[PDB]
Design a protein around this nucleic acid. Structure first.
Ligand SMILES: Nc1nc2c(ncn2[C@@H]2O[C@H](COP(=O)(O)O)[C@@H](O)[C@H]2O)c(=O)[nH]1
Ligand SMILES: [Mg+2]
Ligand SMILES: [Mg+2]
Ligand SMILES: [Mg+2]
Ligand SMILES: [Mg+2]
Ligand SMILES: [Mg+2]
Ligand SMILES: [Mg+2]
Ligand SMILES: [Mg+2]
Ligand SMILES: [Mg+2]
Ligand SMILES: [Mg+2]
Ligand SMILES: [Mg+2]
Ligand SMILES: [Mg+2]
Ligand SMILES: [Mg+2]
Ligand SMILES: [Mg+2]
Ligand SMILES: [Mg+2]
Ligand SMILES: [Mg+2]
Ligand SMILES: [Mg+2]
Ligand SMILES: [Mg+2]
Ligand SMILES: [Mg+2]
Ligand SMILES: [Mg+2]
Ligand SMILES: [Mg+2]
Ligand SMILES: [Mg+2]
Ligand SMILES: [Mg+2]
Ligand SMILES: [Mg+2]
Ligand SMILES: [Mg+2]
Ligand SMILES: [Mg+2]
Ligand SMILES: [Mg+2]
Ligand SMILES: [Mg+2]
Ligand SMILES: [Mg+2]
Ligand SMILES: [Mg+2]
Ligand SMILES: [Mg+2]
Ligand SMILES: [Mg+2]
Ligand SMILES: [Mg+2]
Ligand SMILES: [Mg+2]
Ligand SMILES: [Mg+2]
Ligand SMILES: [Mg+2]
Ligand SMILES: [Mg+2]
Ligand SMILES: [Mg+2]
Ligand SMILES: [Mg+2]
Ligand SMILES: [Mg+2]
Ligand SMILES: [Mg+2]
Ligand SMILES: [Mg+2]
Ligand SMILES: [Mg+2]
Ligand SMILES: [Mg+2]
Ligand SMILES: [Mg+2]
Ligand SMILES: [Mg+2]
Ligand SMILES: [Mg+2]
Ligand SMILES: [Mg+2]
Ligand SMILES: [Mg+2]
Ligand SMILES: [Mg+2]
Ligand SMILES: [Mg+2]
Ligand SMILES: [Mg+2]
Ligand SMILES: [Mg+2]
Ligand SMILES: [Mg+2]
Ligand SMILES: [Mg+2]
Ligand SMILES: [Mg+2]
Ligand SMILES: [Mg+2]
Ligand SMILES: [Mg+2]
Ligand SMILES: [Mg+2]
Ligand SMILES: [Mg+2]
Ligand SMILES: [Mg+2]
Ligand SMILES: [Mg+2]
Ligand SMILES: [Mg+2]
Ligand SMILES: [Mg+2]
Ligand SMILES: [Mg+2]
Ligand SMILES: [Mg+2]
Ligand SMILES: [Mg+2]
Ligand SMILES: [Mg+2]
Ligand SMILES: [Mg+2]
Ligand SMILES: [Mg+2]
Ligand SMILES: [Mg+2]
Ligand SMILES: [Mg+2]
Ligand SMILES: [Mg+2]
Ligand SMILES: [Mg+2]
Ligand SMILES: [Mg+2]
Ligand SMILES: [Mg+2]
Ligand SMILES: [Mg+2]
Ligand SMILES: [Mg+2]
Ligand SMILES: [Mg+2]
Ligand SMILES: [Mg+2]
Ligand SMILES: [Mg+2]
Ligand SMILES: [Mg+2]
Ligand SMILES: [Mg+2]
Ligand SMILES: [Mg+2]
Ligand SMILES: [Mg+2]
Ligand SMILES: [Mg+2]
Ligand SMILES: [Mg+2]
Ligand SMILES: [Mg+2]
Ligand SMILES: [Mg+2]
Ligand SMILES: [Mg+2]
Ligand SMILES: [Mg+2]
Ligand SMILES: [Mg+2]
Ligand SMILES: [Mg+2]
Ligand SMILES: [Mg+2]
Ligand SMILES: [Mg+2]
Ligand SMILES: [Mg+2]
Ligand SMILES: [Mg+2]
Ligand SMILES: [Mg+2]
Ligand SMILES: [Mg+2]
Ligand SMILES: [Mg+2]
Ligand SMILES: [Mg+2]
Ligand SMILES: [Mg+2]
Ligand SMILES: [Mg+2]
Ligand SMILES: [Mg+2]
Ligand SMILES: [Mg+2]
Ligand SMILES: [Mg+2]
Ligand SMILES: [Mg+2]
Ligand SMILES: [Mg+2]
Ligand SMILES: [Mg+2]
Ligand SMILES: [Mg+2]
Ligand SMILES: [Mg+2]
Ligand SMILES: [Mg+2]
Ligand SMILES: [Mg+2]
Ligand SMILES: [Mg+2]
Ligand SMILES: [Mg+2]
Ligand SMILES: [Mg+2]
Ligand SMILES: [Mg+2]
Ligand SMILES: [Mg+2]
Ligand SMILES: [Mg+2]
Ligand SMILES: [Mg+2]
Ligand SMILES: [Mg+2]
Ligand SMILES: [Mg+2]
Ligand SMILES: [Mg+2]
Ligand SMILES: [Mg+2]
Ligand SMILES: [Mg+2]
Ligand SMILES: [Mg+2]
Ligand SMILES: [Mg+2]
Ligand SMILES: [Mg+2]
Ligand SMILES: [Mg+2]
Ligand SMILES: [Mg+2]
Ligand SMILES: [Mg+2]
Ligand SMILES: [Mg+2]
Ligand SMILES: [Mg+2]
Ligand SMILES: [Mg+2]
Ligand SMILES: [Mg+2]
Ligand SMILES: [Mg+2]
Ligand SMILES: [Mg+2]
Ligand SMILES: [Mg+2]
Ligand SMILES: [Mg+2]
Lengths: 110, 246
RNA sequence: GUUUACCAAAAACAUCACCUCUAGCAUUACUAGUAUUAGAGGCAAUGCCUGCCCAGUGACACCAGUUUAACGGCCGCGGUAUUCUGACCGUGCAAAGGUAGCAUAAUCACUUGUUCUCCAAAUAAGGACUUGUAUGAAUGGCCACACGAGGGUUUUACUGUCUCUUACUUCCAAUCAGUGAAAUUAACCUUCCCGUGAAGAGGCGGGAAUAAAAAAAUAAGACGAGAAGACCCUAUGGAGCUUUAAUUAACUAUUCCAAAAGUUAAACAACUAACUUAACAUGGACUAGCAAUUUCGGUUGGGGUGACCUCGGAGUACAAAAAACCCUCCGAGUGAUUUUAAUCUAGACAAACCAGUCAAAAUAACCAUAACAUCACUUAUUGAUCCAAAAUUUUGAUCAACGGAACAAGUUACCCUAGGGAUAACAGCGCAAUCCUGUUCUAGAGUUCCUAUCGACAAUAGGGUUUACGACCUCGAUGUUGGAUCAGGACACCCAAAUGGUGCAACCGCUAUUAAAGGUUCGUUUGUUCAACGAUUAAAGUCCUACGUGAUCUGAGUUCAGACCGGAGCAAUCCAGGUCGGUUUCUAUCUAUUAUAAAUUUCUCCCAGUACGAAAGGACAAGAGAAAUGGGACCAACCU
RNA sequence: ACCAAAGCUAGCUCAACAUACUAAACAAAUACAAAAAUACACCAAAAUAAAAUAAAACAUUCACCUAACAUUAAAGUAUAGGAGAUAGAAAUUUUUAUCCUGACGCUAUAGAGAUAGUACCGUAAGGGAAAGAUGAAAGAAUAAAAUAAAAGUAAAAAAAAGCAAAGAUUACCCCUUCUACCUUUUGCAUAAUGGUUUAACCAGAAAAAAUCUAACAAAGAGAACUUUAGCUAGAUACCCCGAAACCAGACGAGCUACCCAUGAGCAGUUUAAAAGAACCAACUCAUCUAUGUGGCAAAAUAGUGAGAAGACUUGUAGGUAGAGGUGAAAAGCCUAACGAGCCUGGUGAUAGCUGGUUGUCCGAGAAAGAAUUUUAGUUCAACCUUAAAAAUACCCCAAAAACCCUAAAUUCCAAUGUAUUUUUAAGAGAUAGUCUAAAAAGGUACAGCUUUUUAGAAACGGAUACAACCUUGACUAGAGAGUAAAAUCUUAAUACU
């Protein structure tokens, strides 16, 4: 026949943890083919463009201003051609850290 | 039985078979895990905890020297040579609580275990038994009904020689010149005063050894135990006595 | 002459004759033979003949080379005689390019080629023409005598084959007497209609009908009885046959090395080897014969043919995930480059399993607090165990049927078994693409004029004949084309009747309405339904009924086993291809059924050569008769 | 009241022991064609077992499989294997006499096939039955005694109407209400399968892990082992019938195919002729038709035909044997079925395929994602069942989830209403699907069509009938009651002087 090989399974791209959930460091928050959600505070980016928590805490989603890295040609060009009042916005994922960094304990009284 | 199919008729395939897709137990690669397992040496562990508990209830008595046969007879331990058990090994589980004073002979021991016995003024020695030897040693009375002489005790194989030649391990083949030195070294390391075994009243029992070629205490290779008459029989022949005593 | 004992007697086989091959020979065949012989085959007497090819494949010759009365093959394109043709010309390719003959044939289709003869009429038969682009010369080609339970055609004659049946005997038959089977059988207290329903009802629904029982008859139904369908498909079910399938023994011949028995020189040059072999006969090889073992991947709107089978992107799948199709579209089975991209480990994604994915901290590398190889839509660029090679640590599959059998093809109509209505062919049912009917709309045809007769582009609705499509009942059988017999029904009327309109003067016609009681021929050819043709008819209707009707018939045709011909295939075998031939069972249990009548149509003669017409032509109604068919009867005569 | 019914014996089965192991009977006759007293010879012999099957195919492999060495262990260990299916040691260990032999074995469809290897069936090898019932006495038959209970009949035919009954009823019918049962299926009154009926026979078997009960317990077991509460014991479990085949060895050529020996037939007519000439009998064939089709006959009868001195018919005796033979090739014939005989054994072959699978009552209860020579099957998930541990489970308001346009709606979650959900241990079935509503795709914007996604259903009430539409949280009894869905649908109209 003319048509061939359209058959491949779904990649299960999606968003694994949702706003308000609790996460432990290293949990994958989302996974994606293109950037849909960008990594925010305490969220690491994988090389496959997936987002994972770097700290134990609570997941939050947010809209924010997007200021691309000047080493990236394309994005800088896109930003440069904008009308003067305009500002790019994107969607971000953060983890609000829950536990205190550490505590001070009494070891020994000399 | 369900309905039609292979199952109602009784014929469903063998166990590992997955329906023709390459079976799970065969797609995994072979790797030595159990490789040469039958030839590995197996030492049944005996903690100081259990040894102490055994002495306390008077199953084994610390008075006379404690070797494998004594442990077996108290049912403190169980050896099955057929499974390639090469004997008892001593582990340190009860070291801190161990107060008894013993002369003990095991086939392997750990530094900490040894130290724990020395501190109380006893003596540990690691001896080797070959499979046949071991079998006879654990169950002597069934051996004596066998009507055979008492065989020589074999030596360790080349792998285990460096173990039994070291005073580190209080090896039965070790050079007794090194013994007091290493024995003191232990006491440096674990910080306890090493008692003088020489000045004790039970000392004659504490120094008691076996010949490296001898299975029991006070019997000798080549004798024969007639248990109905309560007699021992010994070879007077020259060749026999040369063979058994070599 | 022979053959399928029990469905085929033939065109099959054999056969005289003619041809190829193979053998130079002795006590069990051939053969008590000896090349004018004997085996292995081909072809089919006789007659005229048997053309060209050794490139392939064989077989000789163990290689060259030779062989076609060995397997087998024997072509194009362009330009030319004023014109169709193409003697001639050009050129390509082949081992040779189909020669003689015959030819619409028992020869793919076109095909019922064309024409003549035969018949009142022929798809038949015979004679010619003939590119048969698929004839053709010992897998033989062409004539011919005689022969044939072979297959076709004509004439005579004969006849109950038929028009169109009839009488009488015998056996069966029915009654009486004696004896006394078979398949079959859920139970039956066993109706008809329409509806319904696993899509065809004695049993459901709605109606109708209905004292009970024998005996005799008919076969429409009981998807009647028979035989776990022979067609079709499926099964990691068989078997037979053939090989260019994959693995390869024994045996039979060949060839060789070794074994075994031997034999020669005392070898050659200057200052140990080589050769031999009578019959047996061993071990290891070689080449063949004859064989042995085993297999035919799946998906598929039945199988087959074709196509596909793994991985990714987009749609289908509109916003978390997932999500099918022999669904719609693009891709992948890698390049290029240097930044040559380490070890170890919290936690997760994903997930049947196997596989896949991210990743903090910590070490070590390097600026001396220096870990994401980059680009091509970046997503995909891939493959398990075992096992082999490597030696230190790795590498190896269009295993592409891509979760992968270490290595196996055809064919069966000679088939077999197990099943399947889970799946085709017949029939039903659904649907209505195709088909058929009507109406709606008028641009146009009709000299003028849309609708006398038609009617493009389109519209609305029905019917359920065709070819399909679907796979719902039946594969422990619902036996299939056309005839015969008997027909039941619809009306969408062919004839008969009554009318409307006419581009209806009359006769004819062309249309439209109403009407289904009754009718609707005989022949030549085809198996045929169609169709052509001859002769008629008042007319020779269109359809439905399991393309009505095989427990009533037929069997020409399709669809088994035999055989030819053309073609495909190395072969076995095969073709919706032609041709010849080929077993059609049933004693009726149940339902159902087993005779009232009260015509129908033609044609003559009148009507009148009037009505009507320029004439040619030429009526309707009313009125007299005759026939035929159909219903119902009957023998005086005729005839049997 | 017939047909019938009932016995308890015949013997058997499995072991024990045991001497030792071809019984009994032999006058004659027995290996001529066994049972036939008597004439110069011959006589004798061996070659690996194979395959069905398992590997879900099949090619190496596939325990046991007519060879003495037992037992407790080592041990299902070392090893061997398309390193797959499976196969599998040894060293080394253990074993105390003789008597106490019988039976939670059968009772005539059982137990031996057995009253018998007989009758009978096969040419042969070979296959192989059925059958008994009185009593102390039948040297008690005008005979005496206890069942009279199967289907089938008789005593006694039937009377509108309907799966044959049930509600009932004074009353048998008449009335009303119910589409046999198994199997198989998406779905069966089905016109799909099976059964005349009765009796007797006729089909779930195993203890690794587990659960339950108990002993003793850091140990337990009457040796060999296992043990971080275990060990030991007990109890809980996994069918029946069926191919075509394949392999080995016997038996078959008295039918038939072809041979070898040895006999026998062919009259009349026509011809110089006994010439695979002619006419036509006997004889041999088997053309065409009709009968017949459980027949006279497992291939015939009646007519009609073909040959009829030959490649002719035919008797008797002999031969060739299944990987074979024989063949004027029909893949014909080889003892009524030959694409390869028959019989016995291998054999309880093997069937993912069809059929069958036997008391009562109760608790819960299932429609398909993935691989697969796989889509007629399996094995994993998801559901589910039985126990057991727990703690949250559904329902879920804001807030939150993308870049051009985009709906119904999803995801995720407090509260709140409920009592569910998750883990742990066991365990199968199922994995061949229908219609309805919705979103789409394919097709003809066709199908009772096909392929996915969400939802529903599979009444004993309603839609006359009805699978899937609608009503309805399926218990028992009642001669109470209230409700639900639900039963005829409307229109049929055109005057314009
Ligand atoms: N390429 C490849 N072949 C293998 C492998 N394992 C086994 N084989 C098989 O081993 C055999 C080697 O012999 P070959 O046919 O290659 O000469 C083949 O049948 C091959 O299929 C593998 O891992 N890779
Ligand atoms: Mg896709
Ligand atoms: Mg998919
Ligand atoms: Mg069943
Ligand atoms: Mg099934
Ligand atoms: Mg142990
Ligand atoms: Mg015949
Ligand atoms: Mg014959
Ligand atoms: Mg003939
Ligand atoms: Mg015949
Ligand atoms: Mg011939
Ligand atoms: Mg000649
Ligand atoms: Mg000739
Ligand atoms: Mg020639
Ligand atoms: Mg050649
Ligand atoms: Mg040549
Ligand atoms: Mg000619
Ligand atoms: Mg033709
Ligand atoms: Mg030709
Ligand atoms: Mg030829
Ligand atoms: Mg030819
Ligand atoms: Mg002649
Ligand atoms: Mg003739
Ligand atoms: Mg003849
Ligand atoms: Mg003939
Ligand atoms: Mg007559
Ligand atoms: Mg009678
Ligand atoms: Mg009746
Ligand atoms: Mg009906
Ligand atoms: Mg009714
Ligand atoms: Mg009715
Ligand atoms: Mg009938
Ligand atoms: Mg019928
Ligand atoms: Mg029938
Ligand atoms: Mg069948
Ligand atoms: Mg058939
Ligand atoms: Mg067939
Ligand atoms: Mg299969
Ligand atoms: Mg097979
Ligand atoms: Mg080959
Ligand atoms: Mg084999
Ligand atoms: Mg195939
Ligand atoms: Mg298939
Ligand atoms: Mg198809
Ligand atoms: Mg179809
Ligand atoms: Mg193909
Ligand atoms: Mg997950
Ligand atoms: Mg790091
Ligand atoms: Mg595959
Ligand atoms: Mg696959
Ligand atoms: Mg996959
Ligand atoms: Mg395999
Ligand atoms: Mg044929
Ligand atoms: Mg069959
Ligand atoms: Mg069907
Ligand atoms: Mg189906
Ligand atoms: Mg049919
Ligand atoms: Mg058809
Ligand atoms: Mg039909
Ligand atoms: Mg059909
Ligand atoms: Mg039908
Ligand atoms: Mg319609
Ligand atoms: Mg006009
Ligand atoms: Mg019809
Ligand atoms: Mg259709
Ligand atoms: Mg379907
Ligand atoms: Mg059928
Ligand atoms: Mg039937
Ligand atoms: Mg009629
Ligand atoms: Mg009409
Ligand atoms: Mg008329
Ligand atoms: Mg009519
Ligand atoms: Mg039809
Ligand atoms: Mg018909
Ligand atoms: Mg017919
Ligand atoms: Mg009929
Ligand atoms: Mg044909
Ligand atoms: Mg004939
Ligand atoms: Mg024919
Ligand atoms: Mg008939
Ligand atoms: Mg009758
Ligand atoms: Mg009749
Ligand atoms: Mg008139
Ligand atoms: Mg005139
Ligand atoms: Mg008449
Ligand atoms: Mg197998
Ligand atoms: Mg099986
Ligand atoms: Mg097989
Ligand atoms: Mg075997
Ligand atoms: Mg090996
Ligand atoms: Mg395998
Ligand atoms: Mg018996
Ligand atoms: Mg018997
Ligand atoms: Mg009775
Ligand atoms: Mg009634
Ligand atoms: Mg069905
Ligand atoms: Mg089912
Ligand atoms: Mg029903
Ligand atoms: Mg039906
Ligand atoms: Mg019926
Ligand atoms: Mg049905
Ligand atoms: Mg049937
Ligand atoms: Mg039925
Ligand atoms: Mg069935
Ligand atoms: Mg069936
Ligand atoms: Mg049944
Ligand atoms: Mg029946
Ligand atoms: Mg157990
Ligand atoms: Mg059970
Ligand atoms: Mg085989
Ligand atoms: Mg087989
Ligand atoms: Mg004979
Ligand atoms: Mg004569
Ligand atoms: Mg003659
Ligand atoms: Mg006759
Ligand atoms: Mg006659
Ligand atoms: Mg005659
Ligand atoms: Mg004659
Ligand atoms: Mg003649
Ligand atoms: Mg004979
Ligand atoms: Mg064979
Ligand atoms: Mg043969
Ligand atoms: Mg013959
Ligand atoms: Mg032939
Ligand atoms: Mg044939
Ligand atoms: Mg036979
Ligand atoms: Mg079976
Ligand atoms: Mg299957
Ligand atoms: Mg259910
Ligand atoms: Mg495969
Ligand atoms: Mg499962
Ligand atoms: Mg919300
Ligand atoms: Mg919640
Ligand atoms: Mg299935
Ligand atoms: Mg459907
Ligand atoms: Mg659903
Ligand atoms: Mg109802
Ligand atoms: Mg309910
Ligand atoms: Mg309910």
């Amino acid at each position: 026949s003319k048509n061939l090989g359209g058959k491949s399974p779904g990649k299960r791209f999606g968003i694994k943890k949702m706003e308000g959930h609790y996460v432990h460091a290293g949990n994958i928050l989302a996974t994606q083919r293109h950037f849909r959600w960008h990594p925010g505070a305490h969220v690491g980016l994988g090389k496959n463009k997936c987002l994972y928590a770097l700290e134990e805490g609570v997941v939050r989603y947010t809209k924010e201003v997007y200021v691309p890295n000047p080493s990236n040609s394309e994005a800088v060009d896109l930003v440069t051609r904008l009308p003067q009042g305009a500002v790019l916005y994107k969607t971000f994922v953060h983890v609000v850290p829950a536990k205190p960094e550490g505590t001070f304990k009494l070891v020994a009284m000399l | 039985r369900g309905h039609k199919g292979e199952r109602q008729r009784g014929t469903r395939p063998r166990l590992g078979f997955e329906g023709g897709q390459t079976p799970f137990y065969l797609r995994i690669p072979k790797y030595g895990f159990n490789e040469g397992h039958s030839f590995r040496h197996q030492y049944q562990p005996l903690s100081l905890n259990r040894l102490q508990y055994l002495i306390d209830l008077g199953r084994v008595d610390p008075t006379q020297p404690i070797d494998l046969t004594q442990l077996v007879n108290g049912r403190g331990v169980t050896i099955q040579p057929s499974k390639r058990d090469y004997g008892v090994q001593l582990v340190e589980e009860g070291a801190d609580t161990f107060k008894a004073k013993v002369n003990i002979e095991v086939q392997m021991a750990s530094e900490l275990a040894i130290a724990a016995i020395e501190k109380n003024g006893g003596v540990v020695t690691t001896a080797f038994y070959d499979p046949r030897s071991l079998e006879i040693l654990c169950k002597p009375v069934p051996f004596f009904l066998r009507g055979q002489p008492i065989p020589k005790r074999m030596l360790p194989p080349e792998a285990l020689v460096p173990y039994y030649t070291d005073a580190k391990n209080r090896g039965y083949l070790a050079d007794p010149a090194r013994f007091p030195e290493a024995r003191l070294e232990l006491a440096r390391k674990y910080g306890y005063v090493l008692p003088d075994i020489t000045k004790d009243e039970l000392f004659k029992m504490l120094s008691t050894r076996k010949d490296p070629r001898q299975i029991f205490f006070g019997l000798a290779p080549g004798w024969v135990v007639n248990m109905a008459d309560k007699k021992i029989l010994k070879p007077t022949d020259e060749n026999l006595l040369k063979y058994y005593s070599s």
